[PDB]
mmCIF file with all atom_site columns, C-alpha atoms in Angstrom:
data_model
loop_
_atom_site.group_PDB
_atom_site.id
_atom_site.type_symbol
_atom_site.label_atom_id
_atom_site.label_alt_id
_atom_site.label_comp_id
_atom_site.label_asym_id
_atom_site.label_entity_id
_atom_site.label_seq_id
_atom_site.pdbx_PDB_ins_code
_atom_site.Cartn_x
_atom_site.Cartn_y
_atom_site.Cartn_z
_atom_site.occupancy
_atom_site.B_iso_or_equiv
_atom_site.pdbx_formal_charge
_atom_site.auth_seq_id
_atom_site.auth_comp_id
_atom_site.auth_asym_id
_atom_site.auth_atom_id
_atom_site.pdbx_PDB_model_num
ATOM 1   C CA . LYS A 1 1   ? 10.424  6.678   -21.670 1.00 60.33 ? 9   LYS A CA 1
ATOM 2   C CA . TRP A 1 2   ? 12.080  9.014   -19.149 1.00 61.37 ? 10  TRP A CA 1
ATOM 3   C CA . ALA A 1 3   ? 8.840   10.589  -17.898 1.00 59.97 ? 11  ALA A CA 1
ATOM 4   C CA . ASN A 1 4   ? 7.073   7.276   -17.202 1.00 56.98 ? 12  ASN A CA 1
ATOM 5   C CA . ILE A 1 5   ? 10.250  5.661   -15.763 1.00 56.09 ? 13  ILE A CA 1
ATOM 6   C CA . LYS A 1 6   ? 11.153  8.570   -13.435 1.00 51.51 ? 14  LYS A CA 1
ATOM 7   C CA . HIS A 1 7   ? 7.516   8.746   -12.299 1.00 51.34 ? 15  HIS A CA 1
ATOM 8   C CA . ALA A 1 8   ? 7.562   4.963   -11.815 1.00 52.74 ? 16  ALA A CA 1
ATOM 9   C CA . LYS A 1 9   ? 10.809  5.117   -9.804  1.00 48.02 ? 17  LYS A CA 1
ATOM 10  C CA . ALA A 1 10  ? 9.411   8.069   -7.805  1.00 46.90 ? 18  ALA A CA 1
ATOM 11  C CA . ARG A 1 11  ? 6.369   5.947   -6.688  1.00 45.01 ? 19  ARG A CA 1
ATOM 12  C CA . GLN A 1 12  ? 8.567   2.918   -5.986  1.00 43.84 ? 20  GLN A CA 1
ATOM 13  C CA . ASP A 1 13  ? 10.890  5.135   -3.907  1.00 41.11 ? 21  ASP A CA 1
ATOM 14  C CA . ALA A 1 14  ? 7.984   6.756   -1.981  1.00 44.01 ? 22  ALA A CA 1
ATOM 15  C CA . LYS A 1 15  ? 6.583   3.356   -0.987  1.00 45.87 ? 23  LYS A CA 1
ATOM 16  C CA . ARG A 1 16  ? 10.036  2.126   0.010   1.00 43.85 ? 24  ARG A CA 1
ATOM 17  C CA . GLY A 1 17  ? 10.187  5.113   2.391   1.00 43.26 ? 25  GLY A CA 1
ATOM 18  C CA . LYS A 1 18  ? 6.850   4.319   4.078   1.00 44.10 ? 26  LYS A CA 1
ATOM 19  C CA . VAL A 1 19  ? 7.739   0.613   4.421   1.00 43.18 ? 27  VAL A CA 1
ATOM 20  C CA . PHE A 1 20  ? 11.195  1.544   5.776   1.00 42.36 ? 28  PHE A CA 1
ATOM 21  C CA . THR A 1 21  ? 9.582   3.349   8.709   1.00 42.98 ? 29  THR A CA 1
ATOM 22  C CA . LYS A 1 22  ? 7.223   0.440   9.428   1.00 42.95 ? 30  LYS A CA 1
ATOM 23  C CA . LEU A 1 23  ? 10.023  -2.114  9.330   1.00 41.67 ? 31  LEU A CA 1
ATOM 24  C CA . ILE A 1 24  ? 12.223  -0.182  11.775  1.00 38.51 ? 32  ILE A CA 1
ATOM 25  C CA . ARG A 1 25  ? 9.421   -0.193  14.340  1.00 39.57 ? 33  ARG A CA 1
ATOM 26  C CA . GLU A 1 26  ? 8.620   -3.885  13.811  1.00 43.07 ? 34  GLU A CA 1
ATOM 27  C CA . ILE A 1 27  ? 12.317  -4.813  14.178  1.00 41.09 ? 35  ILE A CA 1
ATOM 28  C CA . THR A 1 28  ? 12.518  -2.919  17.473  1.00 40.67 ? 36  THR A CA 1
ATOM 29  C CA . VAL A 1 29  ? 9.285   -4.307  18.895  1.00 38.89 ? 37  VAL A CA 1
ATOM 30  C CA . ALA A 1 30  ? 10.041  -7.876  17.767  1.00 41.77 ? 38  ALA A CA 1
ATOM 31  C CA . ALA A 1 31  ? 13.459  -7.625  19.448  1.00 44.71 ? 39  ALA A CA 1
ATOM 32  C CA . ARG A 1 32  ? 12.097  -6.205  22.705  1.00 43.69 ? 40  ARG A CA 1
ATOM 33  C CA . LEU A 1 33  ? 9.376   -8.866  22.948  1.00 40.38 ? 41  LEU A CA 1
ATOM 34  C CA . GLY A 1 34  ? 11.111  -12.074 21.732  1.00 43.46 ? 42  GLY A CA 1
ATOM 35  C CA . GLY A 1 35  ? 14.757  -11.137 22.504  1.00 41.48 ? 43  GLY A CA 1
ATOM 36  C CA . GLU A 1 36  ? 17.896  -10.024 20.644  1.00 43.43 ? 44  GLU A CA 1
ATOM 37  C CA . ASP A 1 37  ? 18.813  -13.501 19.262  1.00 43.53 ? 45  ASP A CA 1
ATOM 38  C CA . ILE A 1 38  ? 17.259  -13.656 15.753  1.00 45.66 ? 46  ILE A CA 1
ATOM 39  C CA . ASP A 1 39  ? 17.737  -17.437 15.598  1.00 44.37 ? 47  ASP A CA 1
ATOM 40  C CA . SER A 1 40  ? 15.445  -17.855 18.668  1.00 42.18 ? 48  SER A CA 1
ATOM 41  C CA . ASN A 1 41  ? 12.986  -15.160 17.643  1.00 43.47 ? 49  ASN A CA 1
ATOM 42  C CA . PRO A 1 42  ? 10.884  -16.120 14.542  1.00 43.43 ? 50  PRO A CA 1
ATOM 43  C CA . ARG A 1 43  ? 9.069   -12.776 14.530  1.00 45.48 ? 51  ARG A CA 1
ATOM 44  C CA . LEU A 1 44  ? 12.365  -10.936 14.462  1.00 45.00 ? 52  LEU A CA 1
ATOM 45  C CA . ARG A 1 45  ? 13.701  -13.430 11.880  1.00 45.84 ? 53  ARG A CA 1
ATOM 46  C CA . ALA A 1 46  ? 10.871  -12.556 9.495   1.00 47.98 ? 54  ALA A CA 1
ATOM 47  C CA . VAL A 1 47  ? 11.143  -8.748  9.734   1.00 47.75 ? 55  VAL A CA 1
ATOM 48  C CA . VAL A 1 48  ? 14.965  -8.754  9.592   1.00 45.52 ? 56  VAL A CA 1
ATOM 49  C CA . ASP A 1 49  ? 14.773  -10.839 6.398   1.00 45.84 ? 57  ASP A CA 1
ATOM 50  C CA . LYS A 1 50  ? 12.264  -8.329  4.977   1.00 44.95 ? 58  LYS A CA 1
ATOM 51  C CA . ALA A 1 51  ? 14.576  -5.470  6.011   1.00 46.04 ? 59  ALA A CA 1
ATOM 52  C CA . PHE A 1 52  ? 17.647  -7.010  4.299   1.00 45.24 ? 60  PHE A CA 1
ATOM 53  C CA . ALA A 1 53  ? 15.482  -7.824  1.231   1.00 47.74 ? 61  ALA A CA 1
ATOM 54  C CA . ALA A 1 54  ? 14.461  -4.117  1.132   1.00 47.94 ? 62  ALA A CA 1
ATOM 55  C CA . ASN A 1 55  ? 18.197  -3.235  1.328   1.00 46.77 ? 63  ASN A CA 1
ATOM 56  C CA . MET A 1 56  ? 17.797  -1.435  4.663   1.00 45.13 ? 64  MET A CA 1
ATOM 57  C CA . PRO A 1 57  ? 21.320  -0.665  5.890   1.00 47.95 ? 65  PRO A CA 1
ATOM 58  C CA . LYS A 1 58  ? 22.785  -3.277  8.223   1.00 50.62 ? 66  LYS A CA 1
ATOM 59  C CA . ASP A 1 59  ? 23.577  -0.636  10.867  1.00 50.66 ? 67  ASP A CA 1
ATOM 60  C CA . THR A 1 60  ? 20.008  0.640   10.866  1.00 50.38 ? 68  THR A CA 1
ATOM 61  C CA . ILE A 1 61  ? 18.853  -2.951  11.361  1.00 51.20 ? 69  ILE A CA 1
ATOM 62  C CA . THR A 1 62  ? 21.274  -3.763  14.195  1.00 51.65 ? 70  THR A CA 1
ATOM 63  C CA . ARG A 1 63  ? 20.580  -0.470  16.007  1.00 51.26 ? 71  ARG A CA 1
ATOM 64  C CA . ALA A 1 64  ? 16.847  -1.106  15.762  1.00 54.94 ? 72  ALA A CA 1
ATOM 65  C CA . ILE A 1 65  ? 17.457  -4.567  17.298  1.00 56.21 ? 73  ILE A CA 1
ATOM 66  C CA . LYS A 1 66  ? 19.614  -3.131  20.120  1.00 56.04 ? 74  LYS A CA 1
ATOM 67  C CA . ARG A 1 67  ? 16.962  -0.487  20.851  1.00 55.14 ? 75  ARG A CA 1
ATOM 68  C CA . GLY A 1 68  ? 14.676  -3.392  21.839  1.00 57.53 ? 76  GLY A CA 1
ATOM 69  C CA . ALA A 1 69  ? 16.403  -4.704  25.004  1.00 57.37 ? 77  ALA A CA 1
ATOM 70  C CA . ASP A 1 70  ? 11.366  3.994   21.893  1.00 54.19 ? 83  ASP A CA 1
ATOM 71  C CA . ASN A 1 71  ? 8.317   2.938   23.987  1.00 52.99 ? 84  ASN A CA 1
ATOM 72  C CA . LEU A 1 72  ? 6.477   1.532   21.000  1.00 53.09 ? 85  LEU A CA 1
ATOM 73  C CA . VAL A 1 73  ? 3.290   -0.335  21.908  1.00 51.70 ? 86  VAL A CA 1
ATOM 74  C CA . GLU A 1 74  ? 1.088   -2.663  19.901  1.00 51.94 ? 87  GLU A CA 1
ATOM 75  C CA . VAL A 1 75  ? -2.543  -1.550  19.441  1.00 47.75 ? 88  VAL A CA 1
ATOM 76  C CA . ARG A 1 76  ? -5.335  -2.976  17.338  1.00 50.73 ? 89  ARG A CA 1
ATOM 77  C CA . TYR A 1 77  ? -8.274  -0.909  16.117  1.00 50.34 ? 90  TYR A CA 1
ATOM 78  C CA . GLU A 1 78  ? -11.489 -2.472  14.827  1.00 52.06 ? 91  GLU A CA 1
ATOM 79  C CA . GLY A 1 79  ? -14.234 -0.768  12.831  1.00 51.38 ? 92  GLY A CA 1
ATOM 80  C CA . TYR A 1 80  ? -16.504 -0.746  9.808   1.00 51.14 ? 93  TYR A CA 1
ATOM 81  C CA . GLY A 1 81  ? -16.094 0.924   6.415   1.00 51.60 ? 94  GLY A CA 1
ATOM 82  C CA . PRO A 1 82  ? -18.082 1.291   3.122   1.00 55.47 ? 95  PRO A CA 1
ATOM 83  C CA . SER A 1 83  ? -21.037 -1.135  2.858   1.00 55.69 ? 96  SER A CA 1
ATOM 84  C CA . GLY A 1 84  ? -20.305 -2.361  6.407   1.00 52.92 ? 97  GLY A CA 1
ATOM 85  C CA . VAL A 1 85  ? -16.970 -3.969  5.559   1.00 55.16 ? 98  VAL A CA 1
ATOM 86  C CA . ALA A 1 86  ? -15.214 -5.135  8.740   1.00 55.70 ? 99  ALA A CA 1
ATOM 87  C CA . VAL A 1 87  ? -11.764 -3.575  9.124   1.00 56.91 ? 100 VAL A CA 1
ATOM 88  C CA . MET A 1 88  ? -8.894  -4.375  11.536  1.00 55.91 ? 101 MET A CA 1
ATOM 89  C CA . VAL A 1 89  ? -5.872  -2.096  11.856  1.00 55.97 ? 102 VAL A CA 1
ATOM 90  C CA . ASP A 1 90  ? -2.737  -3.319  13.611  1.00 57.57 ? 103 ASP A CA 1
ATOM 91  C CA . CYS A 1 91  ? -0.441  -0.550  14.811  1.00 62.11 ? 104 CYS A CA 1
ATOM 92  C CA . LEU A 1 92  ? 2.913   0.137   16.414  1.00 63.23 ? 105 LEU A CA 1
ATOM 93  C CA . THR A 1 93  ? 2.923   3.574   18.037  1.00 64.42 ? 106 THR A CA 1
ATOM 94  C CA . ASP A 1 94  ? 4.537   5.639   20.799  1.00 59.11 ? 107 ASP A CA 1
ATOM 95  C CA . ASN A 1 95  ? 1.298   7.641   21.219  1.00 59.86 ? 108 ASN A CA 1
ATOM 96  C CA . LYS A 1 96  ? -2.058  5.854   21.112  1.00 58.63 ? 109 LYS A CA 1
ATOM 97  C CA . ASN A 1 97  ? -4.023  9.142   21.478  1.00 59.85 ? 110 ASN A CA 1
ATOM 98  C CA . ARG A 1 98  ? -2.364  10.442  18.319  1.00 58.84 ? 111 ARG A CA 1
ATOM 99  C CA . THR A 1 99  ? -2.848  7.182   16.428  1.00 58.22 ? 112 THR A CA 1
ATOM 100 C CA . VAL A 1 100 ? -6.501  6.568   17.375  1.00 63.30 ? 113 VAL A CA 1
ATOM 101 C CA . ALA A 1 101 ? -7.449  10.095  16.244  1.00 65.26 ? 114 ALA A CA 1
ATOM 102 C CA . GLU A 1 102 ? -5.638  9.646   12.908  1.00 66.95 ? 115 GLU A CA 1
ATOM 103 C CA . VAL A 1 103 ? -7.279  6.246   12.388  1.00 71.35 ? 116 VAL A CA 1
ATOM 104 C CA . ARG A 1 104 ? -10.736 7.650   13.333  1.00 70.64 ? 117 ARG A CA 1
ATOM 105 C CA . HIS A 1 105 ? -10.177 10.507  10.848  1.00 67.65 ? 118 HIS A CA 1
ATOM 106 C CA . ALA A 1 106 ? -9.442  8.044   8.027   1.00 67.58 ? 119 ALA A CA 1
ATOM 107 C CA . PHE A 1 107 ? -12.518 5.939   8.835   1.00 66.01 ? 120 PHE A CA 1
ATOM 108 C CA . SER A 1 108 ? -14.642 9.055   9.129   1.00 65.41 ? 121 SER A CA 1
ATOM 109 C CA . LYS A 1 109 ? -13.475 10.388  5.747   1.00 68.10 ? 122 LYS A CA 1
ATOM 110 C CA . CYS A 1 110 ? -14.624 7.107   4.201   1.00 70.90 ? 123 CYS A CA 1
ATOM 111 C CA . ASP A 1 111 ? -18.083 6.974   5.865   1.00 71.49 ? 124 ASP A CA 1
ATOM 112 C CA . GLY A 1 112 ? -16.916 4.491   8.487   1.00 68.17 ? 125 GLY A CA 1
ATOM 113 C CA . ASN A 1 113 ? -16.120 4.344   12.183  1.00 66.80 ? 126 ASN A CA 1
ATOM 114 C CA . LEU A 1 114 ? -14.249 2.463   14.902  1.00 65.03 ? 127 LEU A CA 1
ATOM 115 C CA . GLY A 1 115 ? -16.125 0.012   17.138  1.00 63.61 ? 128 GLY A CA 1
ATOM 116 C CA . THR A 1 116 ? -15.197 -1.832  20.310  1.00 64.38 ? 129 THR A CA 1
ATOM 117 C CA . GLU A 1 117 ? -12.369 -4.273  20.890  1.00 66.54 ? 130 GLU A CA 1
ATOM 118 C CA . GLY A 1 118 ? -13.507 -7.670  19.571  1.00 59.25 ? 131 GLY A CA 1
ATOM 119 C CA . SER A 1 119 ? -16.228 -6.114  17.375  1.00 58.00 ? 132 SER A CA 1
ATOM 120 C CA . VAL A 1 120 ? -14.699 -7.623  14.184  1.00 56.47 ? 133 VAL A CA 1
ATOM 121 C CA . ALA A 1 121 ? -11.593 -9.646  15.230  1.00 54.83 ? 134 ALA A CA 1
ATOM 122 C CA . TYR A 1 122 ? -13.583 -12.913 15.447  1.00 55.32 ? 135 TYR A CA 1
ATOM 123 C CA . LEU A 1 123 ? -14.098 -12.758 11.650  1.00 56.34 ? 136 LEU A CA 1
ATOM 124 C CA . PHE A 1 124 ? -10.340 -12.922 10.964  1.00 54.77 ? 137 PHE A CA 1
ATOM 125 C CA . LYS A 1 125 ? -8.217  -16.025 11.504  1.00 55.70 ? 138 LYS A CA 1
ATOM 126 C CA . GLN A 1 126 ? -4.670  -17.002 10.583  1.00 52.77 ? 139 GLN A CA 1
ATOM 127 C CA . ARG A 1 127 ? -4.853  -19.916 8.184   1.00 55.40 ? 140 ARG A CA 1
ATOM 128 C CA . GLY A 1 128 ? -2.491  -21.982 6.124   1.00 55.47 ? 141 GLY A CA 1
ATOM 129 C CA . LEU A 1 129 ? -3.302  -21.682 2.429   1.00 55.26 ? 142 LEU A CA 1
ATOM 130 C CA . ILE A 1 130 ? -1.698  -24.092 -0.006  1.00 54.73 ? 143 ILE A CA 1
ATOM 131 C CA . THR A 1 131 ? -2.461  -23.491 -3.681  1.00 59.56 ? 144 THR A CA 1
ATOM 132 C CA . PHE A 1 132 ? -2.088  -26.098 -6.366  1.00 60.81 ? 145 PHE A CA 1
ATOM 133 C CA . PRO A 1 133 ? -2.045  -25.149 -10.043 1.00 63.24 ? 146 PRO A CA 1
ATOM 134 C CA . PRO A 1 134 ? -4.427  -26.313 -12.773 1.00 62.54 ? 147 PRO A CA 1
ATOM 135 C CA . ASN A 1 135 ? -3.818  -29.968 -13.787 1.00 59.36 ? 148 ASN A CA 1
ATOM 136 C CA . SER A 1 136 ? -3.173  -30.972 -10.178 1.00 61.36 ? 149 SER A CA 1
ATOM 137 C CA . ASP A 1 137 ? -4.521  -34.338 -8.966  1.00 62.90 ? 150 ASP A CA 1
ATOM 138 C CA . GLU A 1 138 ? -7.795  -33.204 -7.402  1.00 64.07 ? 151 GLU A CA 1
ATOM 139 C CA . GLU A 1 139 ? -8.596  -36.714 -6.074  1.00 63.62 ? 152 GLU A CA 1
ATOM 140 C CA . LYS A 1 140 ? -5.229  -37.288 -4.407  1.00 64.72 ? 153 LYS A CA 1
ATOM 141 C CA . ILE A 1 141 ? -5.180  -33.798 -2.872  1.00 67.74 ? 154 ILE A CA 1
ATOM 142 C CA . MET A 1 142 ? -8.640  -34.434 -1.388  1.00 69.66 ? 155 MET A CA 1
ATOM 143 C CA . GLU A 1 143 ? -7.626  -37.871 -0.029  1.00 71.50 ? 156 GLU A CA 1
ATOM 144 C CA . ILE A 1 144 ? -4.561  -36.378 1.728   1.00 72.71 ? 157 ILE A CA 1
ATOM 145 C CA . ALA A 1 145 ? -6.520  -33.320 2.968   1.00 72.67 ? 158 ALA A CA 1
ATOM 146 C CA . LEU A 1 146 ? -9.139  -35.484 4.728   1.00 75.49 ? 159 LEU A CA 1
ATOM 147 C CA . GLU A 1 147 ? -6.419  -37.866 6.037   1.00 78.19 ? 160 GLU A CA 1
ATOM 148 C CA . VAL A 1 148 ? -4.331  -35.022 7.526   1.00 77.93 ? 161 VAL A CA 1
ATOM 149 C CA . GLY A 1 149 ? -7.124  -32.763 8.826   1.00 78.75 ? 162 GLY A CA 1
ATOM 150 C CA . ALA A 1 150 ? -7.257  -29.897 6.311   1.00 78.31 ? 163 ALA A CA 1
ATOM 151 C CA . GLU A 1 151 ? -9.872  -27.252 7.151   1.00 80.62 ? 164 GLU A CA 1
ATOM 152 C CA . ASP A 1 152 ? -11.094 -26.832 3.556   1.00 80.98 ? 165 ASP A CA 1
ATOM 153 C CA . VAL A 1 153 ? -10.452 -27.747 -0.069  1.00 81.16 ? 166 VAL A CA 1
ATOM 154 C CA . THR A 1 154 ? -11.757 -25.536 -2.878  1.00 81.18 ? 167 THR A CA 1
ATOM 155 C CA . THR A 1 155 ? -11.468 -26.325 -6.576  1.00 81.32 ? 168 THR A CA 1
ATOM 156 C CA . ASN A 1 156 ? -11.754 -23.208 -8.728  1.00 85.49 ? 169 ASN A CA 1
ATOM 157 C CA . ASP A 1 157 ? -13.117 -22.811 -12.269 1.00 84.79 ? 170 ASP A CA 1
ATOM 158 C CA . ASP A 1 158 ? -9.583  -22.913 -13.741 1.00 83.01 ? 171 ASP A CA 1
ATOM 159 C CA . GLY A 1 159 ? -8.815  -26.243 -12.067 1.00 82.96 ? 172 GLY A CA 1
ATOM 160 C CA . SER A 1 160 ? -6.587  -24.713 -9.361  1.00 81.76 ? 173 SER A CA 1
ATOM 161 C CA . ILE A 1 161 ? -7.046  -26.114 -5.846  1.00 79.35 ? 174 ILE A CA 1
ATOM 162 C CA . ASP A 1 162 ? -6.766  -24.105 -2.612  1.00 80.31 ? 175 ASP A CA 1
ATOM 163 C CA . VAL A 1 163 ? -6.303  -26.097 0.616   1.00 79.63 ? 176 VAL A CA 1
ATOM 164 C CA . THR A 1 164 ? -6.782  -24.190 3.896   1.00 80.29 ? 177 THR A CA 1
ATOM 165 C CA . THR A 1 165 ? -5.274  -25.416 7.161   1.00 82.93 ? 178 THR A CA 1
ATOM 166 C CA . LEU A 1 166 ? -5.076  -24.446 10.806  1.00 81.43 ? 179 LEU A CA 1
ATOM 167 C CA . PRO A 1 167 ? -1.794  -22.529 11.289  1.00 81.96 ? 180 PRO A CA 1
ATOM 168 C CA . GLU A 1 168 ? -0.421  -25.333 13.482  1.00 85.74 ? 181 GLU A CA 1
ATOM 169 C CA . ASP A 1 169 ? -1.075  -27.970 10.776  1.00 85.21 ? 182 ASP A CA 1
ATOM 170 C CA . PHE A 1 170 ? 0.319   -25.934 7.891   1.00 87.10 ? 183 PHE A CA 1
ATOM 171 C CA . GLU A 1 171 ? 3.838   -27.447 7.798   1.00 85.85 ? 184 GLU A CA 1
ATOM 172 C CA . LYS A 1 172 ? 2.680   -31.064 8.258   1.00 87.52 ? 185 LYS A CA 1
ATOM 173 C CA . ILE A 1 173 ? 0.005   -30.821 5.571   1.00 91.33 ? 186 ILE A CA 1
ATOM 174 C CA . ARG A 1 174 ? 2.367   -29.113 3.157   1.00 92.16 ? 187 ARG A CA 1
ATOM 175 C CA . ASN A 1 175 ? 4.877   -31.864 3.882   1.00 93.24 ? 188 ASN A CA 1
ATOM 176 C CA . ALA A 1 176 ? 2.235   -34.554 3.301   1.00 91.27 ? 189 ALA A CA 1
ATOM 177 C CA . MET A 1 177 ? 1.323   -33.035 -0.052  1.00 90.74 ? 190 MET A CA 1
ATOM 178 C CA . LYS A 1 178 ? 4.935   -32.835 -1.203  1.00 94.18 ? 191 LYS A CA 1
ATOM 179 C CA . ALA A 1 179 ? 5.555   -36.398 0.021   1.00 89.88 ? 192 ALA A CA 1
ATOM 180 C CA . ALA A 1 180 ? 2.759   -37.568 -2.323  1.00 87.76 ? 193 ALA A CA 1
ATOM 181 C CA . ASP A 1 181 ? 4.448   -35.583 -5.128  1.00 88.27 ? 194 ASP A CA 1
ATOM 182 C CA . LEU A 1 182 ? 1.715   -32.941 -5.097  1.00 84.71 ? 195 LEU A CA 1
ATOM 183 C CA . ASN A 1 183 ? 3.724   -29.767 -5.755  1.00 85.93 ? 196 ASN A CA 1
ATOM 184 C CA . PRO A 1 184 ? 2.045   -26.533 -4.687  1.00 83.59 ? 197 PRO A CA 1
ATOM 185 C CA . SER A 1 185 ? 2.340   -23.386 -6.752  1.00 85.34 ? 198 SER A CA 1
ATOM 186 C CA . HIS A 1 186 ? 2.340   -21.375 -3.526  1.00 83.74 ? 199 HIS A CA 1
ATOM 187 C CA . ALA A 1 187 ? 1.902   -21.893 0.193   1.00 82.05 ? 200 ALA A CA 1
ATOM 188 C CA . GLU A 1 188 ? 1.671   -19.474 3.131   1.00 81.13 ? 201 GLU A CA 1
ATOM 189 C CA . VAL A 1 189 ? 0.062   -18.737 6.462   1.00 77.79 ? 202 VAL A CA 1
ATOM 190 C CA . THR A 1 190 ? -2.136  -15.687 6.052   1.00 76.08 ? 203 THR A CA 1
ATOM 191 C CA . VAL A 1 191 ? -5.171  -13.952 7.500   1.00 78.03 ? 204 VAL A CA 1
ATOM 192 C CA . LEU A 1 192 ? -8.549  -15.014 6.022   1.00 78.13 ? 205 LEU A CA 1
ATOM 193 C CA . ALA A 1 193 ? -12.017 -13.640 6.666   1.00 79.23 ? 206 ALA A CA 1
ATOM 194 C CA . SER A 1 194 ? -14.854 -16.021 7.645   1.00 78.94 ? 207 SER A CA 1
ATOM 195 C CA . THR A 1 195 ? -17.422 -13.917 5.751   1.00 77.48 ? 208 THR A CA 1
ATOM 196 C CA . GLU A 1 196 ? -16.943 -11.403 2.934   1.00 78.05 ? 209 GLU A CA 1
ATOM 197 C CA . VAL A 1 197 ? -18.757 -8.208  1.981   1.00 79.34 ? 210 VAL A CA 1
ATOM 198 C CA . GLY A 1 198 ? -19.460 -7.671  -1.738  1.00 80.31 ? 211 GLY A CA 1
ATOM 199 C CA . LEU A 1 199 ? -18.782 -4.137  -2.959  1.00 77.18 ? 212 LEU A CA 1
ATOM 200 C CA . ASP A 1 200 ? -20.002 -2.204  -5.991  1.00 77.31 ? 213 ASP A CA 1
ATOM 201 C CA . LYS A 1 201 ? -17.451 -0.172  -7.958  1.00 73.16 ? 214 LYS A CA 1
ATOM 202 C CA . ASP A 1 202 ? -18.083 2.979   -5.921  1.00 75.36 ? 215 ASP A CA 1
ATOM 203 C CA . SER A 1 203 ? -18.022 1.351   -2.483  1.00 73.69 ? 216 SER A CA 1
ATOM 204 C CA . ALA A 1 204 ? -14.907 -0.584  -3.589  1.00 75.40 ? 217 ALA A CA 1
ATOM 205 C CA . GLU A 1 205 ? -13.151 2.628   -4.606  1.00 75.16 ? 218 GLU A CA 1
ATOM 206 C CA . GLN A 1 206 ? -13.987 4.121   -1.218  1.00 72.99 ? 219 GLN A CA 1
ATOM 207 C CA . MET A 1 207 ? -12.730 0.990   0.621   1.00 73.80 ? 220 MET A CA 1
ATOM 208 C CA . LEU A 1 208 ? -9.519  1.056   -1.415  1.00 73.61 ? 221 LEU A CA 1
ATOM 209 C CA . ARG A 1 209 ? -9.077  4.713   -0.466  1.00 69.26 ? 222 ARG A CA 1
ATOM 210 C CA . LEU A 1 210 ? -9.600  3.867   3.203   1.00 71.22 ? 223 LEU A CA 1
ATOM 211 C CA . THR A 1 211 ? -6.946  1.111   3.056   1.00 70.18 ? 224 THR A CA 1
ATOM 212 C CA . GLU A 1 212 ? -4.546  3.521   1.370   1.00 69.80 ? 225 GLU A CA 1
ATOM 213 C CA . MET A 1 213 ? -5.196  6.287   3.925   1.00 68.86 ? 226 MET A CA 1
ATOM 214 C CA . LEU A 1 214 ? -4.546  3.911   6.824   1.00 67.76 ? 227 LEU A CA 1
ATOM 215 C CA . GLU A 1 215 ? -1.404  2.360   5.329   1.00 66.89 ? 228 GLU A CA 1
ATOM 216 C CA . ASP A 1 216 ? 0.024   5.837   4.761   1.00 66.66 ? 229 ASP A CA 1
ATOM 217 C CA . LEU A 1 217 ? 0.158   6.334   8.529   1.00 68.96 ? 230 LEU A CA 1
ATOM 218 C CA . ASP A 1 218 ? 3.569   5.454   9.989   1.00 69.45 ? 231 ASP A CA 1
ATOM 219 C CA . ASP A 1 219 ? 1.745   4.051   13.035  1.00 71.41 ? 232 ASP A CA 1
ATOM 220 C CA . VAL A 1 220 ? -0.115  1.479   10.939  1.00 72.22 ? 233 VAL A CA 1
ATOM 221 C CA . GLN A 1 221 ? 1.576   -1.868  10.249  1.00 70.66 ? 234 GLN A CA 1
ATOM 222 C CA . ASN A 1 222 ? -1.241  -3.920  8.672   1.00 67.31 ? 235 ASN A CA 1
ATOM 223 C CA . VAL A 1 223 ? -4.833  -3.381  7.557   1.00 64.67 ? 236 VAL A CA 1
ATOM 224 C CA . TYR A 1 224 ? -7.188  -6.350  7.217   1.00 66.69 ? 237 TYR A CA 1
ATOM 225 C CA . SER A 1 225 ? -10.716 -6.331  5.782   1.00 65.21 ? 238 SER A CA 1
ATOM 226 C CA . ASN A 1 226 ? -13.373 -8.750  4.602   1.00 65.17 ? 239 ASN A CA 1
ATOM 227 C CA . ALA A 1 227 ? -13.997 -6.733  1.434   1.00 68.18 ? 240 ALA A CA 1
ATOM 228 C CA . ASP A 1 228 ? -14.729 -8.700  -1.744  1.00 70.48 ? 241 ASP A CA 1
ATOM 229 C CA . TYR A 1 229 ? -13.578 -6.353  -4.476  1.00 65.98 ? 242 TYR A CA 1
ATOM 230 C CA . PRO A 1 230 ? -15.191 -6.613  -7.919  1.00 65.25 ? 243 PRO A CA 1
ATOM 231 C CA . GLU A 1 231 ? -13.075 -7.342  -10.997 1.00 64.34 ? 244 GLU A CA 1
ATOM 232 C CA . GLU A 1 232 ? -14.006 -3.861  -12.331 1.00 63.91 ? 245 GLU A CA 1
ATOM 233 C CA . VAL A 1 233 ? -11.768 -2.084  -9.800  1.00 64.99 ? 246 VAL A CA 1
ATOM 234 C CA . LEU A 1 234 ? -8.971  -4.633  -10.335 1.00 64.36 ? 247 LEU A CA 1
#
């Protein structure tokens, strides 16, 4: 009861704090890059929506916007982790020398290391991913996907269908599906890995730890990897 709930709220609060700090920086940088007008700045639109969803105070949001008009810079690190998993770490920082050392330390603690710019980035692409539930019309989805230039269609053991698209074709293809009364369970543009690296329980635990260490840094915005985690650690 109270023990589990207070402990649960404590964790939920602690994560809200870390995310708060990341959002502030992303608001500021999005504003500085794409401008102060949220309606003409999709990047800013997205983070401001996330900020309001997280109940960040309006004044904190607006001041973060006005600050972009901090000396935060974008930096990407690329490296390898347990079992040679490729890892990309996107950062917003006012001190790259501080950040790179902290990122190296995390990688090093998990038997990994940073490589050169471009050493892994080619494995990771933004892709539209439209997911249809079991009992969807496989045939009709396939017909539309070929007609409209989908990158891939995968039918899973449970009957669910995942359609992957180039980011630029995402909206059109989603619209084509809905027009044919094919209603997706979920659709988004996300980052997908071209190849994956299968992990045993132990390596998976170490990779999870690495992800967690990196995300705990205020300088880190997003961590991507091509790890294929086993069901045992899930």
